[PDB]
């Protein structure tokens, strides 16, 4: 279906929590729990951060990241930026139609 | 300790179907899903589709029509087929798990594995 | 023996000693006054009796009753792990029930102010009914049971029944039953009532699921000395016809003979849980397998045990076959499937028939020269000699025992949501509100205590088993706790079936 | 030689009214497949088996085994007017010789509120066993339905009708009467 | 001791049978456990695809009638068992000749699985058996076992079994071995045929009784040019679904092979078939093999080829002629009756009810007894001899061994009960 919408970009100086959104119709975001984040590098392969809206991976994935759901909107949290921080970020859901679909991603940039 | 490497192509022609597989290594096919999923440059990720290991299948509906997959379990890889490739196809091409628990009727929406990525050019 | 004497302490905690385990569960119930002490005839007419099917007539009473019937009354999720891992089949034997702390509340509204005081010589009527006359609807799986979780206060469920009908109209031979027929006992708030009960003989349930299957049985290495026909023509043409016959082995396996078939089959519908996979129609109620009994329709709900997939297809389910839990704070219409937990009871495969398949062929007529052999599709199967099968897994969430209809005859009466089938299982237990109306009602404490009887395992396997486990995972909530606002949640349906046994 | 006591009673209730019209269920049924009145519109919905639906609820037993029969009129005009007393009755076949179902397995007699029908085969002479239609199924009727194929976005699904079916686990009956 | 016997050969029946013979055991799969499926045989197909292994130990197998006898109802009451006079022999292959000698200090083990531990493939029909003559000298054979597969591959439920893990009897060639087994209680099999039929115990009479369930088969006519012209072996017979995997009914439910009269008629996949002495393997002539007939259960049972009867497909009415249609399959009603499958001196004697919550008359379908606790299985191995290990150490296990086989004798002594 229709592509989860994310802003463009996000910037903050290192040491201070940022919040990314991801909106969603309420058939994606909306009527499930399924929320994902990734992050990704430049030149090489995403990295799953959130799963189940707020669950962190095992391991790999610091506290620092927090996910959190209200409405049509999901949210990435995160807290004390560090310069490996900065990284692309998409949202990606599971839709009514039975599919996947991600965000546009949002750039983050460390001051 | 599951790795993904997957193989293929750099550059295609327009018009004509492309074929990438993917080789899990250090683990096993198993009972996962297997998705695949492409990043044009300088462009958000899009999941193209997985596959099962008993050949079950779901593909993004915008690329459904020209989509095929199959997974092979002797030879322990997965593959993709894409027809009439034209400039829009030019991606990096992942193959990522996604994870999925037997048994119960979760849907399977994440990817928690990742190749390293194959990067394909459509042109003449 | 007094109004400020405790009658009972509280008890919460499970016993392991070796092959049987003693739980011990103990909660704060409340009692309303139920119809204004008054009898009053139900029917669906009363609320508009819409279908056929859906047509009853009975009566509610103003008595409620204590639902013990579900796991995890009994079962904390840490003893039903540390039960499942470990054990080959379980069973109850003992029950000790008990009643005290009766507590009554009289209620006094004046204008928008409600006041609430004791009344100190008010009583409450309870009795349990050990002769089975009346009655008995704790094995249709009902909610008002026992909290899960021991700090919640529950409130006791309406007692009412149904008898004949026709529409909505009783009929003749329809029974009426007074419950204040019943000798009872009467308590004060320093009374207490307590009974024990035996469970009857049951089988052990099978907790384990078998690690073989029921066509793979043979010696691989082996021929078998029976033949089998493998050729019916020599060639490619006129008159080929021929009588050949190859012996059944190793190589080919689906031809060899066998001393034992699958249990039986009533084929389902399957669903698949990939919405898009699904026919774009309305065949929740068309499409079901039911049976019709006096002329009205019935959904095939559970139904015989069989498996819910077949191998490699997680996704489908039979449209009634499964058992279909809500998750906490789950809505009752219309809910979404992310929020229901659907059971799966693909661990039967190896001697059961998959649901949403037929059971096989059979020969439809006489093959002649002129005439090919034709197969039809055997849609439903009952009992042939030879076959075994498997009962349906019990849950944490689910239903213990039932009550075996009292009849001429029934067929292996365990019943068919899951658990104990017994011709006398544990007895209702009636109470209501003694009169006075003054608005009135009571609170106080149930302990339920039962012995359960333990199979172990001696299994040789060498490689590790199953196993239920918590994952080791980051999240917000724990699994079975409480969240930030105090409400307690069963987060999956929790089966019996992790050990594994020969065939 | 020691048997059971022959069954002399009529239950008051039926196999599929045992439950508490009260209370709810806590089991879930699917009601609902399509968001309705569109293309592709595919959904899964489930509701709380209730009193108000008492036809979908969750049962721990289910009807006894039956083979069907033909019907007949006691008014001549009801019935077709051809001869098909041997030709429509119901038999079973042994060693290629065609022997009438008589009586056959106990099945109830008619649905309630039908007097005037009776099996061509199935009752004494003329007998009725009303009194086990509460557990037995009628003699004149399909058992039930069964799914006959797997549906798909392609397929419609289907079901077919069950003239006779064998003992199943969960099967109580009540036997003839004397 | 070396030059003493440890058994004296016993060969009469008395009723209590008496068998003795001669065997020979080799080392199986060079002292190892090897995984096996169909891929590791060429890979099959769906209904073929199995996982599983294969053991070094062997396994006796006297579930042959024609084992325990030379050419109204009986069944088995004690068992007795015994082995002895083994002897381990070597065998050097050099050049031109091999050559056998005696290995005096080497054993054997042997042990049975009396709490059904293992998986039973006692009960599936195998070759192996004693012979029926009391002369010839039988190889042991092989023990394995089959898995859960999703293919040919296996899944987490599979399980594997190590028979090391058994104690076990170690037998030098002076030792010898013996056990006793009780047989449960299990009904006669019925060695008679009905006078009567149960109809004529006159076709719209009423009945008290009616025959027993049915599964119908394809018919085959022993006269070749009766048949059709087309192959119909397997895509004409009856079969049952598993899992996804569908198995042929064979022999399946007791039924007639043949109505009165006619003879020349075999249920397709429901009988048993035999072979006569030196038949090959593979697409041998009708003569080359023995079909057996049911015909004897006719009273009783309907005919495997025949449909079961008819039923009403409708309601009549004043608009609408009676329908009737025919029933390919029936289970049980009550009041059904009906004859178990007859036993052969060729064919089985019992098998293992499989463990499972429920089971419905769980006499065998291919004949014979049909036990919970049947005989155990007895489980035999060479143990290995490692040849000359290296003069340094080295962890790996070692994979060269002494070239060497067992002989012996063995004893059975089944008691029956007559009727």
């Known amino acids: 279906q229709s592509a989860l919408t994310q802003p463009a970009s996000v910037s903050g100086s290192p040491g201070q929590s940022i919040t990314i959104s991801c909106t969603g119709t309420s058939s994606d975001v909306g009527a499930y729990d399924y929320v994902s984040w990734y992050q990704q590098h430049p030149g090489k392969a995403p990295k799953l951060m959130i799963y189940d809206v707020s669950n962190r991976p095992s391991s790999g994935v610091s506290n620092r990241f927090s996910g959190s759901k209200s409405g049509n909107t999901a949210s990435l949290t995160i807290s004390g930026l560090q310069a490996e921080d900065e990284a692309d970020y998409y949202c990606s859901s599971y839709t009514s139609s039975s599919t996947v679909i991600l965000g546009g991603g949002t750039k983050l940039t460390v001051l | 300790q599951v790795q993904l490497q997957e193989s293929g192509p750099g550059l295609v022609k327009p018009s004509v179907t492309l074929s990438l597989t993917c080789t899990v290594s250090?683990?096993?096919?198993?009972?996962?899903?297997w998705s695949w999923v492409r990043q044009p440059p300088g462009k958000g990720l899009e999941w193209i589709g997985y596959?099962?290991?008993?050949?079950?299948?779901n593909y993004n509906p915008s690329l459904k029509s020209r989509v095929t997959m199959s997974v092979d379990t002797s030879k322990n890889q997965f593959s993709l087929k894409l027809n009439s490739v034209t400039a829009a196809d030019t991606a990096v091409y992942y193959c990522?798990?996604?994870?999925?628990?037997?048994?119960?009727?979760?849907?399977?929406?994440?990817?928690?594995?990742w190749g390293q990525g194959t990067l394909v050019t459509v042109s003449s | 023996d007094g109004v400020g004497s405790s009658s009972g302490n509280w008890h919460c905690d499970s016993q392991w000693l070796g092959d049987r385990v003693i739980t011990t569960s103990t909660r704060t119930w409340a009692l309303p006054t139920y119809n204004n002490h008054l009898y009053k005839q139900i029917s669906n007419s009363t609320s508009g009796g819409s279908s056929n099917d859906n047509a009853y007539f009975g009566y509610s009473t103003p008595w409620g009753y204590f639902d013990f019937n579900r796991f995890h009354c009994h079962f904390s999720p840490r003893d039903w792990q540390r039960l499942i891992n470990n054990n080959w089949g379980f069973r109850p034997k003992r029950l000790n029930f008990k009643l005290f702390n009766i507590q009554v509340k009289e209620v006094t509204d004046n204008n928008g102010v409600k006041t609430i005081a004791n009344n100190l010589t008010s009583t409450v009527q309870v009795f349990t009914d050990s002769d089975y006359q009346l009655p008995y609807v704790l094995g249709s799986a009902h909610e008002g049971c026992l909290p899960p979780f021991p700090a919640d206060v529950f409130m006791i469920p309406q007692y009412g029944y149904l008898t004949l009908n026709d529409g909505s109209q009783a009929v003749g031979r329809s029974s009426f039953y007074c419950l204040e027929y019943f000798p009872s006992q009467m308590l004060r708030t320093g009374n207490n009532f307590q009974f024990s009960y035996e469970f009857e003989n049951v089988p052990f349930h099978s907790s384990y699921a078998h690690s073989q299957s029921l066509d793979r049985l043979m010696n691989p290495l082996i021929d078998q000395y029976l033949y089998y026909l493998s050729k019916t023509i020599n060639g490619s043409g006129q008159n080929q016809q021929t009588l050949k016959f190859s012996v059944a082995g190793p190589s080919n396996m689906a031809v060899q003979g066998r001393n034992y078939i699958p249990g039986p089959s009533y084929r389902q519908q399957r669903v698949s849980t990939t919405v898009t996979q699904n026919n774009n129609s309305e065949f929740a109620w068309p499409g079901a397998s039911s049976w019709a009994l006096n002329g009205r329709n019935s959904l095939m709900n559970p139904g015989p045990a069989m498996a819910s997939h077949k191998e490699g297809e997680d996704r489908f389910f039979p449209l009634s076959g499964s058992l279909i839990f809500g998750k906490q704070g789950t809505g009752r219409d219309n809910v979404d499937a992310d929020k229901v937990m659907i059971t799966n009871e693909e661990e039967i495969k190896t001697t059961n028939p998959v649901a949403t398949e037929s059971y096989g062929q059979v020969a439809t007529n006489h093959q002649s020269a002129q005439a090919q052999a034709q197969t039809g599709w055997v849609q439903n199967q009952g009992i042939l000699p030879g076959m075994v099968w498997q009962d349906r897994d019990v849950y944490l969430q689910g239903p213990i025992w039932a009550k075996i209809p009292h009849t001429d005859g029934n067929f292996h009466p365990s019943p068919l949501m899951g658990g104990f089938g017994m011709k006398h299982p544990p007895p209702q237990i009636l109470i209501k509100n003694t009169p006075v109306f003054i608005t009135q009602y009571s609170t106080g404490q149930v302990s339920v205590e039962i012995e359960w009887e333990l199979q172990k395992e001696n299994s040789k396997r060498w490689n590790p088993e199953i196993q239920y486990t918590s994952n080791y995972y980051k999240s917000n909530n724990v699994e079975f706790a409480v969240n930030t606002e105090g409400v307690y949640s069963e987060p999956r349906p929790i089966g019996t079936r992790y050990l594994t046994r020969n065939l | 030689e020691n048997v059971p006591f022959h069954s002399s009673y009529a239950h008051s209730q039926s196999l599929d009214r045992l439950m508490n019209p009260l209370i709810d269920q806590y089991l879930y049924y699917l009601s609902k497949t399509i968001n309705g009145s569109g293309q592709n519109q595919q959904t899964l919905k489930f509701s709380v088996a209730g009193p108000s639906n008492m036809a979908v609820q969750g049962r721990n037993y289910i009807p006894g085994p039956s083979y069907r029969q033909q019907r007949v009129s006691t008014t001549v005009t009801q019935n077709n007017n051809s001869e098909f007393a041997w030709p429509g009755a119901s038999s079973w076949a042994l060693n290629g010789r065609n022997s009438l179902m008589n009586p056959g397995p106990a099945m109830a007699s008619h649905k309630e509120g039908e007097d005037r029908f009776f099996p061509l085969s199935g009752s004494l002479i003329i007998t009725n066993e009303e009194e086990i239609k509460t557990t037995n199924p009628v003699a004149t009727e399909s058992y039930g339905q069964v799914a006959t194929n797997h549906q798909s976005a392609q397929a419609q699904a289907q079901t077919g009708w069950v003239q006779n079916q064998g003992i199943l686990p969960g099967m109580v009956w009540q036997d003839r009467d004397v | 001791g070396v030059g003493s016997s440890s058994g004296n050969w016993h060969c009469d029946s008395q009723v209590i049978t008496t068998s003795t013979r001669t065997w020979a055991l080799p080392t199986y799969n060079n002292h190892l456990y090897k995984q096996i499926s169909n891929s590791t045989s060429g890979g099959s197909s769906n209904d073929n695809a199995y996982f599983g292994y294969s053991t070094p130990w062997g396994y006796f197998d006297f579930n042959r009638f024609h084992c325990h006898f030379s050419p109204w109802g009986f069944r088995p009451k004690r068992l007795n068992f015994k082995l002895f006079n083994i002897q381990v022999k070597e065998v050097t292959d050099n050049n031109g000749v091999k050559t056998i000698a005696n290995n005096l200090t080497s054993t054997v083990q042997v042990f049975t699985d009396s709490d059904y531990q293992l998986p039973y493939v006692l009960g599936s029909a195998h070759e192996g058996c004693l012979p029926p003559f009391p002369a010839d000298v039988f190889m042991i054979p092989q023990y394995g076992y089959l898995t859960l597969n999703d293919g040919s591959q296996a899944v987490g439920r599979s399980s594997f079994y190590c028979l090391e893990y058994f104690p076990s009897q170690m037998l030098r060639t002076g030792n010898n071995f013996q056990f006793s087994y009780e047989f449960e209680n299990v009904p006669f099999h019925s060695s008679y045929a009905h006078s009567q039929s149960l109809d004529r115990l006159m076709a719209v009479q009423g009945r008290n009784y009616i025959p027993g369930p049915s599964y119908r088969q394809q018919r085959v006519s022993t006269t070749v040019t009766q048949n059709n012209n087309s192959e119909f072996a397997w895509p004409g017979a009856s079969s049952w679904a598993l899992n996804g995997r569908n198995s042929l009914m064979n022999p399946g439910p007791a039924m007639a092979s043949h109505k009165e009269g006619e003879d020349r008629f075999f249920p397709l996949s429901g009988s048993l078939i035999f072979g006569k002495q030196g038949t090959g393997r593979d697409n041998v002539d009708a003569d080359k093999v023995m079909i057996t007939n049911e015909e004897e259960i006719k009273t009783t049972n309907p005919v495997a080829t025949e449909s079961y009867g008819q039923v009403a497909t409708n309601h009549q009415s004043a608009q609408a002629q009676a329908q009737t249609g025919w029933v390919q399959n029936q289970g049980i009603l009550p009041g059904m009756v009906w004859q178990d499958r007859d036993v052969y001196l060729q064919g089985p004697i019992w098998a293992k009810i499989p463990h499972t919550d429920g089971n419905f008359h769980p006499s065998p379908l291919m004949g014979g007894f049909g036990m919970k606790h049947p005989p155990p299985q007895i489980l035999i191995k060479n143990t290995p001899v490692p040849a000359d290990p290296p003069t340094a150490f080295n962890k790996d296990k070692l994979n060269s061994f002494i070239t060497q086989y067992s002989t012996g004798q063995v004893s059975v002594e089944i008691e029956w009960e007559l009727q």
């Open positions: 990522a798990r996604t994870h999925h628990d037997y048994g119960d009727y979760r849907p399977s929406y994440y990817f928690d594995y």
């Open positions: 596959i099962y290991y008993s050949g079950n299948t």
């Open positions: 250090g683990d096993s096919i198993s009972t996962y899903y």
